[PDB]
Design an enzyme around this catalytic site. Structure first.
Site, PDB file in Angstrom:
ATOM      1  N   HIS A  12       2.519 -30.527  27.359  1.00  0.00           N
ATOM      2  CA  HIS A  12       1.179 -30.135  26.826  1.00  0.00           C
ATOM      3  C   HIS A  12       1.135 -29.801  25.328  1.00  0.00           C
ATOM      4  CE1 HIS A  12      -0.262 -30.453  30.808  1.00  0.00           C
ATOM      5  NE2 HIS A  12       0.635 -29.575  31.237  1.00  0.00           N
ATOM      6  N   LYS A  41       1.635 -40.231  35.464  1.00  0.00           N
ATOM      7  CA  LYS A  41       0.790 -39.026  35.644  1.00  0.00           C
ATOM      8  C   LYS A  41      -0.640 -39.466  35.367  1.00  0.00           C
ATOM      9  CE  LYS A  41       0.423 -34.112  34.760  1.00  0.00           C
ATOM     10  NZ  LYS A  41       0.603 -33.058  33.747  1.00  0.00           N
ATOM     11  N   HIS A 119       1.002 -23.926  33.137  1.00  0.00           N
ATOM     12  CA  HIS A 119       0.239 -25.114  33.600  1.00  0.00           C
ATOM     13  C   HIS A 119      -0.998 -25.284  32.719  1.00  0.00           C
ATOM     14  CE1 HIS A 119       2.865 -25.081  37.183  1.00  0.00           C
ATOM     15  NE2 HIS A 119       2.319 -23.928  37.625  1.00  0.00           N
ATOM     16  N   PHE A 120      -1.419 -26.513  32.462  1.00  0.00           N
ATOM     17  CA  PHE A 120      -2.735 -26.785  31.832  1.00  0.00           C
ATOM     18  C   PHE A 120      -3.757 -26.980  32.954  1.00  0.00           C
ATOM     19  CE2 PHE A 120      -5.090 -27.537  28.002  1.00  0.00           C
ATOM     20  CZ  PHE A 120      -6.242 -28.088  28.504  1.00  0.00           C
ATOM     21  N   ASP A 121      -4.815 -26.180  33.018  1.00  0.00           N
ATOM     22  CA  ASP A 121      -5.659 -26.172  34.240  1.00  0.00           C
ATOM     23  C   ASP A 121      -6.909 -27.005  34.012  1.00  0.00           C
ATOM     24  OD1 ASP A 121      -5.636 -25.156  36.999  1.00  0.00           O
ATOM     25  OD2 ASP A 121      -7.536 -24.240  36.440  1.00  0.00           O
TER      26      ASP A 121
END
Length: 124
Positions: A12, A41, A119-121
């Protein structure tokens, strides 16, 4: 072994004035960051702010995570990001993305001691 924090930096963080590449940012970046190793991904966001500014989101606005956890944090300021969404014709291992540059509030899951992004949400 890769920490959840180091994994979030790999997946990220792209601390850059704006977002730069030789050809197609998402195609190059999804490959160079090993996000096309086991599969394409389908979606991935890169953040072009300093690591300090992104880590600081963990002390900003507490919101619900998309999966129901309550350890997510929305940035008070908009941030320079790039979204990568796999195209319809994308086929592994030749992963193909549409690049979408944006300035938005990021939502990240924060975890650990110290309390850091893992995490990137979402972006809003």
């Amino acid at each position: 072994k890769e920490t959840a924090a180091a994994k979030f930096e790999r997946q990220h963080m792209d601390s850059s004035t704006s977002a730069a590449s030789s050809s197609n940012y998402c195609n190059q970046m999804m490959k160079s960051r090993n996000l096309t190793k086991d599969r394409c991904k389908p979606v991935n966001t890169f953040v072009h702010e300093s690591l300090a500014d992104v880590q600081a989101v963990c002390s900003q606005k507490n919101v619900a995570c998309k999966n129901g956890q309550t350890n997510c944090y929305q940035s008070y300021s908009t941030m320079s990001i790039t979204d990568c969404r796999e195209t319809g014709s994308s086929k592994y291992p030749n992963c193909a993305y549409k690049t979408t540059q944006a300035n938005k509030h990021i939502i990240v899951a924060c975890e650990g001691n110290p309390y850091v992004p893992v995490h990137f949400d979402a972006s809003v």
